[PDB]
Amino acid sequence: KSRRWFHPNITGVEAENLLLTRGVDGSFLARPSKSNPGDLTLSVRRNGAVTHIKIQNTGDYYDLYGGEKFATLAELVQYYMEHHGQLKEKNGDVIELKYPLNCADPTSERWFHGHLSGKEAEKLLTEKGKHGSFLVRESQSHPGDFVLSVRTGDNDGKSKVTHVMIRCQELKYDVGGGERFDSLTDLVEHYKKNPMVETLGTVLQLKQPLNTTRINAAEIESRVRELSKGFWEEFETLQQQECKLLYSRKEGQRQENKNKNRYKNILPFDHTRVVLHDSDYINANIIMPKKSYIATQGCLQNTVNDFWRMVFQENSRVIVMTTKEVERGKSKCVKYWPDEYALKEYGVMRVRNVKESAAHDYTLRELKLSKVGQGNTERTVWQYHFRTWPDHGVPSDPGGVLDFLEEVHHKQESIMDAGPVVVHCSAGIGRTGTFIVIDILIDIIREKGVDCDIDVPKTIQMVRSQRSGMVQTEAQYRSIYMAVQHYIETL
Ligand SMILES: CCCCCCCCCCCC[N+](C)(C)C
């Protein structure tokens, strides 16, 4: 599901049009809604009419109206393309997702810039680019045409930049002869597989798009200023890449494991799932960026014992909890720790709550975890329970967030051979992914100094390849920039 079925700037009327005139029954597209930001609409054609299904994400997962909850839009679409009869209209009424109505718009492509000059394209390609780096810009010469600028090189023996005219005639694109493509993306994909060769020998390889998101950490404030009056655009360009991350989640799908998941369709990747060698399943993934994380869901009553098996096995010594046990009347996490001073056995695992320390935003619980029957397997696990995450959106004071983050960091660093830092919320991808990504970026700055490069979208995509949908919303996306900005500007 190459997110081509996602149309980043399109009306409801435009969508109906497109489906009726360019589609058939079973055609579908996804669009960001303008009843409200953060909400998507899945527009589907059936019986010659178009229906619109709402999809909300308030930060925890994608909530399909009248359907199930999903980690990403790609994972939602993949599910319903392989599960006909499941997507229902007004009770029972099977809506079918058959044929993705693709988008011709290049706007959210990593290689598309437009509004860009030949000499400026050269600057950027010489500044940040390498061999095979490319981009497509609008032609300032003949207005409506496009230009493909490519760095050919080799250290990577710098060398050269080439510009290839792309002509646009009767709403099709070509490079001067040969095939005429319906979209810039089709042109680029075609010459990605069939590299244009120069009359003289040079092969114009399109390897990777020009990086436009990596900044110097010291300059993040200027970047944030630039984005504050286009955060949305950089987010959508990251979203479009999630189609690359549809890895298998077989184990979480097994019958014996179904009810060990808080949300049926929000599962851990097989290739990074935490495997319990002590039945072998828990809805949790190792996140490897030296400090690593386990990103996991809040306990269900029947996974409390497996959670402590995991903490013990993985030698985790710090837990970060980013949710109340219940919010808005719903249960986000069952209490998996004893009351202060109490001792409990959770299966073969025994834990005592040694002491609780209350701060304003969080409560720290000093827990001692051992295997029942085996003294001297005991270790302290420090549960940092963050209590003040708001019901809507994200924290609005970077001070307390960064105080909490710094404390959690320094606890982990003081413990010899501590294992992954366990982080969880409700589904374990939204608030969890946001914390982890911030902590990773701030770890980069804290080690390499304020002069280092950081790349926020790239770091997120790297983490999302290890667990589905890490970082859920645009609000959380912006919050990552704000947190790193504050950290930088308090140094
Ligand atoms: C208006 C400025 C907004 C700044 C937002 C700061 C980051 C909020 C999300 C991370 C909180 C992680 N946490 C709380 C668990 C440590």
From Swiss-Prot:
Changing residue 425 to S: Abolishes phosphatase activity. Enhances interaction with NEDD9. The keyword Coiled coil does not apply. The active site is at residue 425. Its EC number is 3.1.3.48. Changing residue 464 to W: In LPRD1; reduced phosphatase activity. The modification N-acetylthreonine is found at residue 1. Residues 231-483 form the Tyrosine-protein phosphatase domain. Changing residue 70 to K: In acute myeloid leukemia; requires 2 nucleotide substitutions. The modification Phosphotyrosine is found at residues 61, 65. It catalyses: O-phospho-L-tyrosyl-[protein] + H2O = L-tyrosyl-[protein] + phosphate. Substrate binds at residues 391, 425-431, 472. Keywords: Acetylation, Cytoplasm, Deafness, Disease variant, Hydrolase, Nucleus, Phosphoprotein, Protein phosphatase, Repeat, SH2 domain. It is linked to LEOPARD syndrome 1: A disorder characterized by lentigines, electrocardiographic conduction abnormalities, ocular hypertelorism, pulmonic stenosis, abnormalities of genitalia, retardation of growth, and sensorineural deafness. Belongs to the protein-tyrosine phosphatase family. Non-receptor class 2 subfamily. This is Tyrosine-protein phosphatase non-receptor type 11. It comes from Homo sapiens (Human).
